[PDB]
Design a protein around this nucleic acid. Structure first.
Ligand SMILES: [Mg+2]
Ligand SMILES: [Mg+2]
Ligand SMILES: [Mg+2]
Ligand SMILES: [Mg+2]
Lengths: 180, 190, 40, 457, 256, 226, 107, 213, 251
RNA sequence: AAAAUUUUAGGAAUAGUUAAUAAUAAUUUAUAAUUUUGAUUAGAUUGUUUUGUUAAUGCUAUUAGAUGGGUGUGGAAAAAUAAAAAAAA
């Protein structure tokens, strides 16, 4: 909605837009370069701190030898290490409750961590993208579909309330003799 | 790394372990004053600027900083600083408007001591109770006119002498004998 | 961006853009497929 | 340590009853509402607000410590003044309901007796005006710029200025419970107790009270007889206590609840419900000494009558024998449809009965169960365009379609019904969609989205 | 150009209009500062208000401080009448004759059956309440309105012996209305506002006079000072206007 | 907002759609409402090479020296007519030829009858402005055997994409009133032999094999040799 | 009536209003004739717009049309700044010529 | 709706109470003119700018804030628009509809409204200038329109004002009425510069309740 | 988008961004556009259950004085054709107007004539619609229209009074959307009908040995398309339905 | 909407102007407002987590970024080169 658009760094919608989790670091020689996982708005200003919701972490893209742990004859442990600090309470808050967006590189990271499934942009160019036809899918679905109530209860436990009360803690929480 | 010597430096891009990442601003610049005016003619009536002027506020030596702790915060729990003030009513020439002189506090950390400054406010008294020389409680509120954000919350001490003085048709307080100072000599005789 | 291929409906106009997004039915079917995958 | 007002106590006792835990309500009672009184001739009726509200004398302001001057709005300070309207009778009622719900007769008899006595012999307390904070004072607006009723050329859009769709669910047409006289509140209290009896019955036998999930639905439970006995004794206790006074107050809600109890717990066919309701109304017109001019059964009562007919004809669908449907033993569709027809004649005769979606749903369901094959025509004439619907309609309607002669009609009728769903903003439900899916080999009708299927595999 | 671009007194949101209305559908225009114009400016005063059942019945008797002869008050009210009548002589029926001027300490309804028990009992309780109170010097300045500008009165300033009045009144209030149940138009746990009624519009009058006393008459006398008076005499009066030429007096108490 | 694509799912900006909702996203701009539009540029774009070697005149050239052989005028008129149908036929070009200005006839656009898309418009009435080829056209929309209750202005009546079929049965005189055709579920009892439903709310079409071949020969599953 | 309400927030003039008490200092002729001039605004106005509609409609034409001319047509933080010269001092010499000084009041 | 009858009935039962002492005005606060925020907000008279948890006694409303609707012709650059302007009075409870007309005439500040005689009406039915608000059941929520003399002539091209877009404005009428005030001939600062909405704002069909396409 | 809270931005007096107030002109076709679909609903009501003021015996008569505080909004039905007194008669022959009465004339009583009647003083209107023949709806015995000879002499008229140039609110049609059931389909099973014995139930679905005939093979459309109607937020036809379900749009 | 913190060696008056009224007043009403507890003009100066020295109350730095209105669009003017913000497959 700017009369003469700022041409180089366009976005979608008005700024500040919905918060997006980005990786960003000042540019330098490749030997020292680190990145910041940051929840911030869609439209950045000159200094990235002006719109910054939260600071999620440091990520160093240099494979490192592990000198912190003792040298271990185990094969896998002596592959190089890649270090990252995730703040996952803030991540689950922002992503889950506040409904963030995600750039692709942080997505790859958080996929490695086990917080998210691997991204849309991670492609083994070995396999193609799948085909689809509705009648075959339908045969498979009629073949396997679970009961309605089972499914409803699964959606209940995953989305709505998890912690529930067994009859036991009811019986243990209900008042005894003098006020019963 | 600010703790490393001039010669000890290797990389300027990162902190190896921890600590504070510090930009050196160059404090000693030998900054100077340019003299653009004759000592005779300086283009200001009240003050003259002949040297480098110290700048900033709170960056100003010796530092004078806001002191939350004084009488006013001692008595009140304020939702916002300056939401309550105790003062004296000085003058009512304006309808439904009481001017109030109030004290607040400044701290000099260099000398470790406090000073009281003073400031005037316009307060809104509907119904016109306040007589000059009342001790009043005053609160922050809705914007009322250009300069009135404060209203008279309670009269702590009314002026009984002043009220009885008014009832007799006389002014609340005698008008001050001399006004503001002047740089002239007024010769006015008889 | 929205990809505009060369076999989209060419707009013959000198007063504006040379290519209107309008799809060969093939392109529509294709797009539907890809988009199913990302739905997954 | 916030002392609950009377309103709060009410709410928590509602939670207690619905939970059926007596042991909560007991401790709550014992702690908070004990000293709660009723209102008598010597009582002063709604008590004025007596609180000062909090200020400081200049000596209080200057000489006190910081905390003594600290006022956060604290619920406890005005608790007295929230209670100034005497909602006590509600608390006593709820407590009766709980003691019943937890299966204890003596305590229940106690609370209900106290309540009854007070309602008969003590003045009606002045009701509290609507709480500004719970429900909001309506603010003035012109209704001029509004999507017109016919705004979308494809359907009837309901609008802020007026409702063209019609009521989806029947409402009882009674003011909020606190506005009742004391006698009226006595009646209301009995209907409340009955409702709790019903709820407890459904929590003990969820299988039998759900429509057509099991054949168990068609037969009285043992323990139903003792229950109905309790209800009988209760209602006759109400006629015993209130005299001619009953001639002057609304019995509508009471009747509908009575009917729903004799429909659900004891299971009575639609004709038995209409009979029962008419005998009750005769009783009410006779106790008051007059010329008659009986009030007709109001819309809600008829809703219970019709749902009675629908209970009458109900089928357990899709036995694992690949057998079609099981029906209530001793079922005559001819009789059922006879009575349903002249009953709807009766209803549509009376001008003061407002129709809703659910009434139509009971009718339609009875039509499907009866094998009328007119279910469609009724639905399309009287419902489709002029109401907002569940997909329950389309569920029983599907069961109707399934029974036609050739296959193609089945298919085409079903597909058309789905088109209805897309046109009229029925979000066709998962139950319906499963019902259609089951026959996919026969009808080849796809019910799922492309995306839904993909994601699913 | 001669002031603020948007004068601060003109910034007003009406929350008693639905949300969204003023943005799109229509704009609502009103002179909003007639309503916001305050209780000091209009000259209204909030009297103890009656419960509806009490509001139904006419008041019969009232407590009054009797003004002595040779008052500052009576004199200045006469001067005020002169001025008002010279300005607008339509006031003439509104005005109360200087002969009937009295301080109204409270108003009450006595039923005609229990009449003697109540007057004797009241008179007695009154005499006990005022036993210890010496005479009262009170100050009068300012005007005010009761009953939507129909009653125009002289305020009693709380600058003087007024404090004592307030306890004194609040005692009879707790006896006459608390002890023996009597209809005081308000709550006995609430204090009455003492006043000297100057102009009044009765129900019968209201048709020819109008529904409210125009503020243009008394605007200038609104804050006028009527002076100080010492008062030794408390009356309980029934309101009959032809018996003695002064309100008919059922009881009396001397403050000394 | 009212009707999102796939509920809110934000994992990509493209995941939302090309418009967030059918309803206009700012209230101050109503025309942003989601329609079904048409390629106006190509479909106006009439062929100017048809007017080659013609010698048209203008309207206000009435001069004696200006106009031409009656033969030249005739081939001019024919050239102009061919120039106006050169893309497709506009409604108002179809309607003037039919009896009663084509009241009652069913006007379908080309793309409305192909694929699982089935839609047409029964004409309620017509206003010819002084210029033909333009105007206003009102009617009932019939989509998959389901019809509108009231008439509506036909959108894109001016764009030349339209076909119809003249039937004497459907003709209405200007005296009477064009009835809305029956929606097949409600007014007329549903019949399979009379009308079969192309597609229904949860349906969609099977994969045509040439598209599949092409997409695999694209993604590089099935080989393609130069 | 000398104390304000802590929980309510209403001033002392408010609780005095509610208890039906009036504290007011004795007024000189200034305040009396100002107030007595202001009290009557609405009666004068009612009389004006009853008895003389054309004059009124003239003045109104000028006001209504004025609202569209002028410096600022809409209220924003810039326009609705109670002290314009104060909050923007940086405009005072060059751009904005209306005010010659940045402070006309206490603050 | 439900509120109206809930509170009506509540008031009506409150009035029939034989025993009530009456409220204590030290316990029944007024409202504040002093609260945080720059804007001055006018509320319901049952409502306060502070938090009051307790429900106060129902009072009869002696000043009823009537709203009276007018049609204005607003100039926008493309041409004239017909839109709605509400005038809001505070009319005493027992007032006569003649007096409501009078209060409405005094309160309007726009030069374009009250020029001729107007009749108050509710849902198109005229009101007796003679009788009370009580009889017609007029409340704040009630919808009151106002109808001018020439308003039933507005379907013509005469009474409806003429926009300089399609119509001659002559030295005859340059000196008269809204045209004169408007200053048709552009000035450097552009004169009173009216709101503008473009021609294609609503599409080819103007604004409607019913969707026409 | 939601409606914003209040307008503090622009002066109220000037009113600035305001949706125009819609006004119904009686000279144009647009009038009938508004009024017609109401009439049909109204008549439908009259066919099922009684509504009080719908049916008058004779033309209403009022004084000049009380003319505009009584008439406006009034809607009543009469048996014959008689045109209200002191009303100039306008025939509606213009086809665009006639057009909106299509549904009402096909699926309810055939419309014989339409008339716009304007009072001599020009401030009142009467829309007069003359129906011919019996209802194409079934008429209930206890229903209002059963008291009329023109239904169930075959012509009868609807009369609707209104002010000109008013919003399509204060022509009062929205009170009529009360919905009553047509009892015609169940009339078969009432104890009153002698065809109730000719009825036979289908309790069980019949054994089926054949699947539904498969739809004709799908031809992919050959022309250019505007893209996914999903992503363009176009409801399935540009007609009705939800944008989530893309059924019946091309593919 | 406000409250605090505000520089010049030698120091004097400032002004579309205060407060009440109100969708008032290029001439409404008034004993008005800012200042020696340092004003307004005028010089210098980018304001309240950033540096250097030092054992230390100190001294000595800290960039940069919001410059009026005039068909007023937009949720918000921040709207006329100068990115290093992926901008509806
Ligand atoms: Mg300021
Ligand atoms: Mg400057
Ligand atoms: Mg949104
Ligand atoms: Mg400019």
């Amino acid at each position: 909605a700017r009369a003469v658009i700022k041409r180089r760094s366009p976005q979608l919608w008005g700024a500040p837009g919905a918060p997006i989790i980005r990786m960003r670091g000042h540019h330098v020689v490749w030997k020292f370069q680190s990145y910041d996982l940051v929840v911030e708005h869609t439209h950045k200003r000159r200094n990235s701190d002006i719109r910054l919701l939260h600071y999620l972490g440091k990520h160093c893209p240099h494979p490192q030898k592990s000198l912190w742990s003792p040298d271990t004859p185990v094969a896998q442990d002596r592959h190089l290490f890649m270090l990252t600090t995730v703040d996952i309470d803030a991540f689950k808050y922002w992503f889950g409750v506040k409904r963030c967006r995600l750039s692709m590189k942080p997505w790859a990271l958080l996929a490695k961590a086990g917080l998210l499934p691997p991204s849309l942009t991670q492609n083994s160019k070995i396999m193609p993208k799948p085909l689809f036809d509705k009648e075959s899918l339908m045969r498979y679905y009629l073949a396997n579909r679970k009961d309605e109530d089972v499914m409803a209860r699964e959606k209940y436990l995953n989305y709505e309330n998890s912690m529930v009360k067994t009859e036991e803690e009811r019986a243990a929480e209900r008042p005894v003799a003098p006020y019963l | 790394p600010w703790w490393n010597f001039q010669t000890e430096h290797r990389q300027r891009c990162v902190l190896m372990y921890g600590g504070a990442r510090t930009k050196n601003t160059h404090n000693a610049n030998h900054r100077v004053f340019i003299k653009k005016y004759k000592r005779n003619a300086f283009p200001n009536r009240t003050r003259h600027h002949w040297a480098v002027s110290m700048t900033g506020v709170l960056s100003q030596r010796p530092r004078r900083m806001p002191w939350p702790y004084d009488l006013t915060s001692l008595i009140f729990n304020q939702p916002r600083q300056g939401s309550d003030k105790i003062g004296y009513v000085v003058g009512t020439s304006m309808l439904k408007t009481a001017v109030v002189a109030t004290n607040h506090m400044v701290y000099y950390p260099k000398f470790n001591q406090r000073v009281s400054r003073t400031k005037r406010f316009f307060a809104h008294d509907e119904d016109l109770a306040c007589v000059e020389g009342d001790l009043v409680h005053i609160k922050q509120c809705r914007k009322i006119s250009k300069y009135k954000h404060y209203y008279v919350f309670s009269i702590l001490e009314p002026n009984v002498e002043g009220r009885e003085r008014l009832k007799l048709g006389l002014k609340a307080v005698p008008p001050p004998l001399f006004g503001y100072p002047v740089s002239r000599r007024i010769v006015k005789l008889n | 961006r929205q990809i505009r291929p060369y076999y989209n409906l060419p707009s013959k106009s000198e007063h504006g853009r040379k290519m209107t997004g309008f799809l060969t039915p093939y392109r529509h079917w294709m797009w539907k497929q890809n988009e199913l995958w990302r739905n997954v | 340590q916030t002392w609950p007002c009377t309103a709060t106590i009410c709410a928590y006792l509602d939670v207690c009853v619905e939970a059926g835990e007596k042991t909560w309500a007991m401790e709550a009672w014992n702690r908070y509402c004990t000293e709660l009184k009723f209102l008598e001739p010597g009582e002063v009726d709604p008590k004025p607000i007596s609180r000062v509200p909090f200020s400081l004398t200049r000596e209080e302001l200057l000489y006190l410590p910081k905390w003594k001057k600290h006022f956060d709005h604290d619920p406890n300070l005005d608790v007295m003044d929230l209670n100034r309207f005497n909602r006590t009778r509600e608390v006593y009622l709820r407590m009766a309901q709980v003691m019943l719900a937890g299966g204890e007769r003596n305590a229940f008899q106690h609370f209900f007796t106290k309540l009854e006595e007070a309602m008969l012999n003590k003045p009606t307390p002045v009701p509290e005006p609507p709480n500004p904070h719970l429900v909001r004072r309506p603010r003035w607006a012109p209704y001029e710029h509004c999507k017109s009723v016919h705004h979308s050329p494809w359907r009837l859009q309901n609008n802020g200025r007026a409702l063209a769709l019609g009521p989806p669910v029947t409402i009882e047409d009674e003011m909020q419970s606190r506005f009742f006289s004391n006698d009226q509140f006595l009646v209301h209290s009995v209907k409340e107790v009955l409702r709790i009896v019903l709820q407890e019955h459904k929590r003990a036998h969820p299988t039998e009270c759900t429509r057509c999930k099991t054949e168990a639905f068609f037969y009285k439970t043992k323990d139903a007889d003792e229950t109905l006995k309790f209800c009988d004794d209760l209602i006759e206790r109400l006629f015993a206590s209130l005299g001619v006074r009953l001639s002057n107050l609304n019995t509508s809600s009471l009747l509908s609840t009575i009917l729903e109890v004799f429909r659900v717990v004891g299971k009575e066919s639609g004709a038995a419900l209409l009979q029962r309701a008419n005998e009750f109304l005769e009783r009410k017109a006779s106790l008051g000494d007059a010329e008659g001019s009986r009030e007709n059964l109001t819309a809600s009562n008829y809703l219970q009558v019709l749902s009675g007919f629908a209970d009458e004809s109900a089928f357990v669908y899709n036995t694992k024998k690949d057998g079609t449907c099981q029906y209530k033993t001793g079922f005559d569709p001819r009789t059922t449809m006879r009575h349903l027809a002249d009953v709807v004649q009766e209803i549509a005769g009376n001008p003061h009965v407002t129709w809703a979606a659910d009434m139509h749903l009971q009718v339609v369901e009875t039509m499907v169960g009866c094998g009328t094959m007119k279910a469609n025509d009724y639905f399309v004439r009287n419902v489709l365009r002029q109401f907002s619907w569940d997909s329950r309609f389309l569920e029983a309607l599907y069961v109707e379609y399934r029974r036609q002669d050739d296959v193609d009609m089945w298919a085409e009728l079903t597909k058309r019904a789905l088109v209805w769903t897309a046109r009229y903003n029925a979000p066709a439900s998962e139950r319906l969609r499963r019902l259609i899916e089951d026959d996919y080999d026969t009808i080849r009708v796809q019910t799922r989205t492309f995306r839904e299927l993909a994601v699913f595999q | 150009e001669r002031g603020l671009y948007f004068p601060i007194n003109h910034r007003i949101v009406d929350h008693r209009i639905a949300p969204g209305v003023t943005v799109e559908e229509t704009d609502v225009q009103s002179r909003y500062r007639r309503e916001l114009r305050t209780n000091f400016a209009t000259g209204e005063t909030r009297q103890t208000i009656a419960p509806p059942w009490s509001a139904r019945e006419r008041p019969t008797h009232f407590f009054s401080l009797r003004l002595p002869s040779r008052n500052s008050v009576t004199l200045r009210v006469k001067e005020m009448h002169n001025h008002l009548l010279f300005s607008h002589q339509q006031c003439a029926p509104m005005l109360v004759s200087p002969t009937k001027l009295h301080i109204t300490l409270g108003v009450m309804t006595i039923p005609e059956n229990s009449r003697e028990e109540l007057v004797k009992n009241i008179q007695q309780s009154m005499s006990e309440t005022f036993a210890c109170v010496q005479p009262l010097q009170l100050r009068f300045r300012g005007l005010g309105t009761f009953d939507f500008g129909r009653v125009l009165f002289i305020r009693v300033v709380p600058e003087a012996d007024f404090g004592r009045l307030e306890r004194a009144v609040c005692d009879i209030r707790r006896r006459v209305g608390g002890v023996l149940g009597v209809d005081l138009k308000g709550n006995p746990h609430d204090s009455y506002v003492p006043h000297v009624t100057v102009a009044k519009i009765r129900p019968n009058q209201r048709q020819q006079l109008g529904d409210t006393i125009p503020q243009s008459l008394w605007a200038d006398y609104q804050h006028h000072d009527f002076g100080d008076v010492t008062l030794s005499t408390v009356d309980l009066c029934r309101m009959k206007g032809s018996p003695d030429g002064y309100y008919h007096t059922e009881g009396a108490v001397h403050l000394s | 907002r009212a009707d999102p694509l796939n509920g809110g799912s934000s994992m990509t900006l493209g995941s939302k759609g090309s418009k967030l909702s059918p309803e206009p996203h700012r209230r101050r701009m109503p025309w942003t409402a989601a329609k079904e539009y048409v390629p106006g540029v190509v479909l106006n774009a009439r062929d100017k090479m048809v007017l080659d070697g013609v010698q048209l005149l203008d309207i206000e050239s009435i001069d004696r020296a200006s106009q031409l052989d009656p033969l030249e005028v005739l081939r001019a008129v024919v050239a102009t007519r061919e120039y106006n149908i050169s893309t497709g036929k506009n409604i108002f070009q179809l309607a003037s030829q039919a009896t009663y200005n084509g009241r009652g006839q069913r006007f379908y656009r080309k793309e409305w009858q192909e694929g699982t898309y089935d839609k047409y418009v029964t004409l309620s009435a017509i206003d010819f402005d002084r210029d033909g080829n333009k105007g206003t056209a009102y009617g009932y929309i019939t989509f998959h055997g389901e019809t509108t209750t009231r008439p509506v202005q036909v959108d894109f009546a001016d764009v030349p994409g339209w076909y119809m079929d003249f039937v004497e049965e459907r003709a209405v005189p200007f005296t009477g009133i064009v009835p809305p055709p029956p929606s097949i579920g409600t007014d007329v009892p549903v019949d399979p032999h009379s009308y079969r439903l192309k597609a229904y709310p949860y349906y969609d079409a099977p994969n045509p094999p040439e598209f599949v071949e092409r997409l695999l020969k694209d993604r590089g599953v099935l080989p393609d040799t130069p | 009536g000398l104390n304000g309400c802590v929980e309510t927030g209403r001033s002392r003039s408010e609780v005095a209003r509610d208890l039906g008490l009036s504290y007011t200092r004795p007024l000189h002729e200034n305040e009396k004739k100002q107030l007595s001039h202001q009290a009557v605004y609405y009666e004068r106005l009612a009389k004006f717009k009853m008895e003389q509609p054309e004059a009124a409609r003239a003045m109104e034409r000028e006001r209504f049309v004025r609202k569209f001319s002028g410096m600022f047509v809409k209220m924003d933080i810039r326009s609705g700044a109670p002290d314009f010269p104060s909050t923007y001092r940086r405009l005072l010499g060059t751009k904005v010529v209306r005010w010659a000084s940045k402070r006309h009041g206490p603050n | 709706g439900h509120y109206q009858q809930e509170a009506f009935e509540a008031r009506k039962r409150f009035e029939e109470s034989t025993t009530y002492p009456g409220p204590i005005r030290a316990a029944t606060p007024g409202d504040t003119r002093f609260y945080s925020g720059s804007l001055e907000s006018i509320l319901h008279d049952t409502d306060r700018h502070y938090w009051r948890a307790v429900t106060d006694d129902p009072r009869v409303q002696h000043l009823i804030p009537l709203r009276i609707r007018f049609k204005i012709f607003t100039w926008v650059t493309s041409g004239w628009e017909q839109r709605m302007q509400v005038v809001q009075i505070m009319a005493p409870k027992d007032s006569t509809i003649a007096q409501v007309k009078d209060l409405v005439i005094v309160e309007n500040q726009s030069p374009y409204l009250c020029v001729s005689s107007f009749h108050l009406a509710i849902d198109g039915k005229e009101l007796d200038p003679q009788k009370t608000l009580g009889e017609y059941g007029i409340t704040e929520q009630s919808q009151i329109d106002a109808i001018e003399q020439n308003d039933h002539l507005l379907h013509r091209d005469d009474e409806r004002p003429r926009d300089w877009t399609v119509d001659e404005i002559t030295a005859e009428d340059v000196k008269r009425s809204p045209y004169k005030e408007m200053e048709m001939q552009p000035l450097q600062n552009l004169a009173p510069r009216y709101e503008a909405r473009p021609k294609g704002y609503f599409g080819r069909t103007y604004y409607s309740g019913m969707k026409q396409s | 988008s939601r409606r914003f809270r209040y307008n503090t931005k622009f002066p109220a007096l000037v009113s600035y961004n305001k949706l125009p107030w819609e006004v119904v002109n009686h000279e144009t076709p647009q009038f009938h556009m508004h009024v017609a679909p109401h009439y049909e609903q109204l008549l439908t009501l009259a066919a099922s259950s009684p509504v009080p003021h719908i049916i008058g015996s004779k033309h209403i008569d009022v004084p000049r004085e009380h003319r505009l505080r009584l008439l406006p909004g009034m809607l009543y039905l009469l048996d014959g054709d008689t045109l209200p007194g002191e009303f100039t008669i306008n025939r509606v022959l213009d086809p665009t107007a006639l057009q909106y009465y299509g549904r009402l004339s096909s699926q309810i009583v055939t419309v014989e004539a339409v008339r716009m009647l304007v009072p001599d003083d020009l401030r009142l209107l009467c829309n007069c619609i003359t129906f011919k023949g019996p209802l194409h709806l079934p008429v209930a015995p206890y229903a209002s229209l059963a008291s009329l000879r023109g239904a169930s002499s075959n012509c009868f008229t609807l009369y609707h009074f209104v002010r000109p140039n008013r919003p399509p609110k204060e022509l009062q049609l929205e009170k009529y959307y009360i919905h009553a059931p047509c009892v015609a389909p169940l009339s078969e099973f009432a104890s009153n009908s002698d065809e109730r014995g000719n009825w036979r139930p289908r309790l069980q679905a019949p054994k089926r040995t054949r699947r539904a005939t498969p739809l004709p093979a799908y031809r992919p459309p050959q022309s250019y398309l505007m893209g996914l109607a999903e992503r363009l937020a176009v409801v399935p036809g540009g007609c009705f339905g939800r944008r989530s379900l893309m059924w019946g749009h091309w593919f």
